[PDB]
């Protein structure tokens, strides 16, 4: 649950992402894959990537980064009223991709890391607080659907 002022911070930060969605999406996935190499094994189309240089050179990884952040941005713009947008993603990630909630924690922290890396000194403590709360809400509502499905 976020206040109006917190949502305003989230959507202000998101403007930074929308200026370069592919570059942000690429770096988020690279941070996930290099920090948590077990996550790469869930992607049949990226498991061939052995080095970060190959990851950086992969145009399909940048494409998928655009898909991921476009979906997340659509959810964030609903300011919590995201049941219709979130349900299909919860279902596909639990039942088809088999993504444990832990990996959603990993990618949430990766987003925070990338924002500081690309905007050092321009991602203030209030903005980090609000973005963190928004990603916690996203993860918590996914977790509720995971529990319904019995997925661990
Ligand atoms: C912010 C969190 C995430 C968002 C918004 C997101 C979004 C998406 C979307 C929109 C798709 C394509 C449609 C679909 O299959 O539902 C997708 C596919 C997929 N996601 Fe995610 N995802 C997220 C996190 C993760 C994480 C953490 C993992 C694994 C560590 C993951 C694994 C996958 C896989 C394996 C696919 C299929 C890729 C393919 O072969 O095309 N997702 N995701």
UniProtKB/Swiss-Prot annotation:
Top-level enzyme category: oxidoreductase
Q: Identify the CDD domains for this entry.
A: Mb
Ranges of residues in domain Globin: 1-147
Q: Which Gene3D superfamilies match?
A: 6.10.140.2100, 6.10.140.2110
Q: Which molecular function term from Gene Ontology is one that the record holds?
A: nitrite reductase activity
Q: Which Pfam families match?
A: Globin
One GO BP on record is:
oxygen transport
* Binding, nitrite: 64
Cellular component annotations (GO), alphabetically ordered: sarcoplasm
Q: Where in the cell is it found?
A: Cytoplasm, Sarcoplasm
**Modification Phosphoserine, positions:** 3
Which InterPro entries does this chain map to?
Globin (IPR000971), Globin-like_sf (IPR009050), Myoglobin (IPR002335)
Q: What EC designation does it have?
A: 1.7.-.-, 1.11.1.-
Q: Which reaction does it catalyse?
A: Fe(III)-heme b-[protein] + nitric oxide + H2O = Fe(II)-heme b-[protein] + nitrite + 2 H(+); H2O2 + AH2 = A + 2 H2O
**Residues noted as binding O2 in the record, renumbered to the chain:** 64
UniProt binding sites for heme b: 93
Ordered alphabetically, the record's keywords are: Cytoplasm, Heme, Iron, Metal-binding, Muscle protein, Oxidoreductase, Oxygen transport, Phosphoprotein, Transport
Briefly state the protein's biological role. Answer: Monomeric heme protein which primary function is to store oxygen and facilitate its diffusion within muscle tissues. Reversibly binds oxygen through a pentacoordinated heme iron and enables its timely and efficient release as needed during periods of heightened demand. Depending on the oxidative conditions of tissues and cells, and in addition to its ability to bind oxygen, it also has a nitrite reductase activity whereby it regulates the production of bioactive nitric oxide.
- Quote the subunit structure annotation: Monomeric.
Similarity field: Belongs to the globin family.
Q: What is this protein called?
A: Myoglobin
What organism is the protein native to? Answer: Equus caballus (Horse)
